[PDB]
Design a protein around this nucleic acid. Structure first.
Length: 207
RNA sequence: AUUGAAAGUUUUUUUUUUUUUUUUUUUUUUUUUUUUUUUUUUUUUUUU
């Protein structure tokens, strides 16, 4: 959904509140739609009947659990995604640059015939071996009353500064927490593995 | 005749072991079985 509002004039730049007002005003256009006829498999399962002109739900290597859209997304993610993060080498540039190689830091002993992407959730959880029971936690954070706070902004520059400060401070907090974990006065292998697992278990951070 | 279905949250684990209601505590301290009462009264060592 594309929302466009006038940004600034020749001798005047509008404050964030008015711009957001214009954006929200030009939002009814989203709710206008027209009629279309198609078929999309409910989720990605089974072989429905519906209209039979097209071929059925494509078969999968594991059997029959692959819809076309999910098939395409899986094809896209086969090369890049979590596996790319695992096969990377993150470096923490500080007074002593320290690198992290999950391919060499995770202590999950797997046979060469096993797929790390399949056991990605277990790896992030912390299964050092397949015969391990261990829960994994999810952390979601969000700012408080951000919308009205940005509404009560004197100038657009103030809004930009506040957003930049928020994002950079969030990233700084995460980095400092990682540094604190790194400086734990314990064996470097343990902290390296923990940092690798934490880094792998990140979906999106910022703002 | 629900998009549509058929699966026991089940098996398995003794709230058990250690610990003496025990030590100390004399039913004794005191009190004369005495106290008033005469073994007394009557009777001729004696006759034909």
């Amino acid at each position: 959904d594309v929302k466009v509002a006038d940004f600034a004039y020749e001798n005047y730049v509008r404050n964030y509140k008015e711009v957001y007002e214009d954006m929200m005003s030009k939002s009814y256009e989203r709710y206008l739609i027209r009629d279309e006829g198609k078929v999309y498999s409910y989720g990605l399962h089974r072989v429905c009947d519906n209209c039979g002109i097209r071929p059925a739900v494509n078969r999968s290597d594991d059997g029959e659990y692959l819809c076309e859209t999910c098939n395409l997304v899986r094809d896209l993610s086969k090369n890049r995604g979590f596996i790319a993060k695992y096969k990377s080498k993150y470096t923490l540039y500080e007074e002593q640059r320290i690198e992290i190689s999950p391919k060499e830091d995770i202590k999950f002993k797997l046979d060469k015939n096993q797929d790390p992407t399949s056991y990605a959730m277990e790896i992030i959880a912390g299964y050092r071996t397949t015969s391990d029971s261990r829960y994994i936690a999810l952390i979601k954070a969000d700012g408080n009353n951000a919308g009205k706070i940005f509404g009560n902004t004197v100038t657009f520059s103030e809004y930009v500064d506040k957003s930049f400060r928020l994002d950079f401070g969030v990233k700084k907090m995460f980095y400092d927490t990682l540094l604190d974990i790194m400086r734990a006065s314990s064996d470097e292998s343990i902290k390296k593995d923990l940092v690798s697992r934490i880094l792998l278990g990140v979906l999106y951070l910022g703002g």
